[PDB]
């Protein structure tokens, strides 16, 4: 199979992105980003074991999420900060990997590269950026998750570490982020 | 098992959309629009047989293409005309099938629904619209096509492709226009490189 490096969170739809890539004949190499602040990659690592997929944690420069924290404090809205982290991350991985994918969904607002942005990336660094969920609305994703996974209400992306930095600074993260996590617990079908 | 109705032209991309839907557990019902001008759907038919998918042709009012013809005559490039037809097809089909799919893709500007057009379409018609290829770019699709399909080139003006083009092209001819001016290759899915 052809190799694809997938930004992976361990959630419902993140796991869906990895499963789709498998069925189309890719060998999905799951990667989760950590900036050496707190080990928030655990959930993703676990669910990758469950998914039956190779997982790796790549550590990046904390400075990236420090700046993100700044942007949160600067804008209140997290969009800009998150756009910054995600983009920078892709630019980084694109210097190592030729085929990249993540779980950006149709209904998502951020992270989300624009058209020119995607083109630029693929052209400048000679890679393929793949977003399998791009064509899939909320209802469809919901249907597909419930066909593929056994799911569960529990109560691994950049948010945990960023929020952590905020706490350290004296800022309440709750102010900058909303309230809602579901866990993939097993397969109903086989990938 | 969940049905889905897939606008289908018979090209390798369109075929990839079918195949993907099937990978995800859907029962794909390939459909090709016809406007009663000419039987340009023949290609899509043969291809569905080869893919092993159920196929149907849906006949729509010829005025839809008559207007696409008018629009071509004045825009001279087909974009606006293609948009108008495909949008019109979706509205009509959305009254009959609650899960609609097509072969729209990341690197084709046209045809393509905007996000706001999509949200409107789904809410007004209480429907699911699915675009498997939207997240895949030119190069990725080129690679996927060659992995799933045996392929061959169709030389310019022999076989008729099964999208709106041919039927539009035809009206333009009748009209005393020159089609080579606006619609001056073709790649045939000849077989499968592996089970779907």
Curated annotation (Swiss-Prot), chain B:
Top-level taxon: Archaea
Pfam families attached to this UniProt entry: DUF7411
InterPro entries to which the protein is assigned, alphabetical: DUF7411 (IPR055834), Rossmann-like_a/b/a_fold (IPR014729)
NCBIfam families: PRK14561.1 (NF011155)
Protein name: Uncharacterized protein MJ0690
Organism of derivation: Methanocaldococcus jannaschii (strain ATCC 43067 / DSM 2661 / JAL-1 / JCM 10045 / NBRC 100440) (Methanococcus jannaschii)
């Amino acid at each position: 199979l052809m190799d694809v490096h997938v930004l992976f969170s361990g959630g419902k739809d993140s796991s869906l992105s990895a499963v789709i890539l498998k069925k189309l004949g890719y060998n999905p190499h799951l990667i989760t980003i950590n900036f050496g602040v707190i080990p928030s990659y655990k959930l993703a690592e676990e669910t990758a074991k469950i998914l039956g997929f190779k997982h790796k944690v790549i550590t990046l420069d904390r400075k990236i999420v420090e700046k993100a924290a700044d942007m949160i404090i600067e804008h209140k809205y997290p969009g800009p900060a998150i756009q910054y982290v995600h983009k920078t991350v892709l630019e980084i991985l694109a210097d190592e990997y030729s085929i990249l994918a993540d779980g950006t969904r149709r209904d998502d607002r951020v992270p989300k590269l624009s058209y020119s942005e995607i083109q630029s990336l693929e052209m400048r660094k000679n890679i393929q950026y793949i977003t399998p969920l791009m064509g899939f609305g909320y209802k469809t994703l919901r249907h597909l998750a419930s066909e593929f996974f056994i799911l569960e209400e529990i109560k691994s992306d950049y948010e945990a570490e960023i929020r952590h930095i905020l706490k350290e600074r004296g800022e309440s993260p709750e102010k900058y982020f909303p309230e809602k996590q579901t866990r993939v617990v097993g397969l109903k079908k086989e990938i």
